[PDB]
């Protein structure tokens, strides 16, 4: 039927016809990545003995590390994880340039004001967010340790401020604010307000009044080469089976076999004259491997006259038949031929095949 | 080969190649004419006897 359709006719003449080129599908997809070691210590960030306060939130830079967000996400110690700029699931996928972490302790009542595009005391006095806040916010409660029976008065918050400051702006001015018209001089007086007021956390406080440690991991976009991002997953290694191999971010197909070539300590790739990849180095165990895209061919249907007979033969041009059952046997220089019997008599050629082999229709 | 050279092992690429029509069939016929003609040359010179 393949020949009868390709020729676009219901009559098929004697000869050999070319149709239905052959390939081999791969099995699975394999990924290899290095031992991922350079992870920055988020443990000392999360388990710090004392966090900064909301008036003077600390700014810390995180660079050239692996920010493993899986441990952060799957941990149940967190109370909420609201993350606005990007999807929380894809944090470890896209690789980022730099991350700045702001750590502070606030009440649970003002947790709403942390969100972008929100109004509140801490959303208008100290902590400001842009309309396009891309950073990622984390919050959890640590009442048992943070709260003091006598009241932990070390923490402070901005009571009265002169104006609403721009996002990512920290102020140190603790001068006596002048809410009234008359100027204020000295330490106290009429309409003389201290800009900072103290938190008092007690175990008797309910939800909202309890101390909540809130940390935001803001980041900047593509003004420098990306270096900070999560881990790259790695799977087991397989050989002698053509697969969709992915080494260090290059994709391809072929059988991975052991190669006796010797590279240089820093060399990674292997290439031939025709400028294509033929070798690769495993990013975990330093070894030299050879690649070979899984094989492929076509189909040559040998048939006599349609009126004479309808039996056909299939020859795969230049294809070894040790892998034939993917789609009588005989192996020749032109390939492996099936469907026809080999004899020892010698007649004249009727349908050429190759390398001296000539098929025909005879008893 | 028709699509292995241009859109090998890619399902998406073979879709846009098919829109060009009979370029695939015509090209394969052109190469076959040259290949078959070569056996005519060798037969014509040496098979005098």
């Amino acid at each position: 039927s393949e020949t009868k359709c390709t020729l676009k006719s219901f009559t098929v003449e004697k000869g050999i016809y070319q149709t239905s080129n052959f390939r081999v599908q791969p099995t699975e997809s394999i990924v290899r990545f290095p031992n991922i070691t350079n992870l920055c210590p988020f443990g000392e960030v999360f388990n710090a003995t004392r966090f900064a306060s909301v008036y003077a939130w600390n700014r810390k830079r995180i660079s050239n590390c692996v920010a493993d967000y899986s441990v952060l996400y799957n941990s149940a110690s967190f109370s909420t994880f609201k993350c606005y700029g990007v999807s929380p699931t894809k944090l470890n996928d896209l690789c980022f340039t730099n991350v700045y972490a702001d750590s502070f302790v606030i009440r649970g009542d003002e947790v709403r004001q942390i969100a972008p595009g929100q109004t509140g005391k801490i959303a208008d006095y100290n902590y400001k967010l842009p309309d396009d806040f891309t950073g990622c916010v984390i919050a959890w409660n640590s009442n048992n340790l943070d709260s003091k029976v006598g009241g932990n008065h070390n923490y402070l918050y901005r009571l009265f401020r002169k104006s609403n400051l721009k996002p990512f702006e920290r102020d140190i001015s603790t001068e006596i604010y002048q809410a009234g018209s008359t100027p204020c001089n000295g330490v106290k007086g009429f309409n003389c307000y201290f800009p900072l007021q103290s938190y008092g956390f007690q175990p008797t406080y309910g939800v909202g009044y309890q101390p909540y440690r809130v940390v935001v991991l803001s980041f900047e976009l593509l003004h420098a080469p990306a270096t900070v991002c999560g881990p790259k997953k790695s799977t087991n290694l397989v050989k002698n089976k053509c697969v969709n191999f992915n080494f260090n971010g290059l994709t391809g197909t072929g059988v991975l076999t052991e190669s006796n070539k010797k590279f240089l300590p820093f060399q990674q790739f292997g290439r031939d004259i025709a400028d294509t990849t033929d070798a690769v180095r495993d990013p975990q165990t330093l070894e030299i491997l050879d690649i070979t895209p899984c094989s492929f061919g076509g189909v040559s249907v040998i048939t006599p006259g349609t009126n004479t007979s309808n039996q056909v033969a299939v020859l795969y041009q230049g294809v070894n038949c040790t892998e034939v059952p993917v789609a009588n046997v005989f192996q020749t220089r032109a390939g492996c031929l099936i469907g026809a019997e080999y004899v020892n008599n010698s007649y004249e050629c009727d349908i050429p095949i190759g390398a001296g082999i000539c098929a025909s229709y005879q008893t | 080969d028709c699509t292995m050279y241009i859109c090998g092992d890619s399902t998406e690429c073979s879709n846009l190649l098919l829109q060009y029509g009979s370029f695939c069939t015509q090209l394969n016929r052109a190469l076959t004419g040259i290949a078959v003609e070569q056996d005519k040359n060798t037969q014509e010179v040496f098979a005098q006897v």
Binding site: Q317, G354 | D1, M4, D39, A47, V49
Partner: peptide, 30 residues
Amino acid sequence: QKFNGLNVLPPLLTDEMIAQYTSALLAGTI
């Protein structure tokens, strides 16, 4: 045989087979 679909076919007459014609031609003319 190659990577990107390219294939080379063997000739119908083997290199030894054409050596029989040359000997036959030279034997007849001698």
